[PDB]
Amino acid sequence: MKCTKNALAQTGFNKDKYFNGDVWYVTDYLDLEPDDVPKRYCAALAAGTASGKLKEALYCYDPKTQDTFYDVSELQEESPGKYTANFKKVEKNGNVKVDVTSGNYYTFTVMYADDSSALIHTCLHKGNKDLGDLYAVLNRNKDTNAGDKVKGAVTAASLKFSDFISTKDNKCEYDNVSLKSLLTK
């Protein structure tokens, strides 16, 4: 398929508050390229800096099988609030499962962020082809419902919040310790 290209980065985006090393949980998401196979997973990420690099680690959990997978990337700023990341898939300890490779990368845009919440758009590419295309509502607390400010950002992006899938009743489990330690790997 083709990923959405036009996402606007938050005006006055504050990169220090966003990239502070702490965890963002995905509370709600809108996947524009869902698999045919019914999938309902949980995800979280942490973005910060390590040894002078911008780093992002990712965590995905499947409550039906208890399967988990992790990724870590160095990020490169394309413009204020827009980033590219060449990811590698890892075990929770950093051991590499799938190396960084050319056409494996995602780009993302921070459309809205404040101290507690954010709306991001991501385009996922594997071996030089547009795979996933996805908006995510994030919060710093896993039990928190999307507040008025973020729902406002969803509206401003010409999206319908009712289209999003909630992770709230999904029996999610998180591994924050590993996400945070992956930042240095």
The answer to whether 108 and 118 have CB atoms below 8 angstroms apart is no
Q: Is residue 89 involved in binding ligand HEM (CB under 6 A)?
A: yes
How many C-beta atoms surround the C-beta of residue 73 within 10 A?
Answer: 23
**Least separation, in Å, of the C-beta of 26 and ligand HEM?**
4
Cα–Cα nearest to 42, from 179, 167, 138 = 167
Question: Rounded to an integer, what distance in angstroms lies between the CA atom of residue 35 and that of residue 132?
Answer: 9
Q: Is residue 39 involved in binding ligand HEM (CB under 6 A)?
A: yes
Q: Give whichever of 89 and 149 is closer to ligand HEM, judged by the CB atom.
A: 89
User: Could you say which residues in the range 163-182 bind ligand HEM, by CB under 6 A?
Assistant: none
| Phi and psi angles of residue 153, each rounded to the nearest 5 degrees, phi first | -60, -40
Q: Is residue 43 involved in binding ligand HEM (CB under 6 A)?
A: yes
The answer to whether 140 and 23 have CB atoms below 8 angstroms apart is yes
Q: Is residue 98 involved in binding ligand HEM (CB under 6 A)?
A: yes
Among 25, 87, 112, 164, binds ligand HEM (CB under 6 A): 87
Q: Is residue 25 involved in binding ligand HEM (CB under 6 A)?
A: no
**Least separation, in Å, of the C-beta of 148 and ligand HEM?**
22
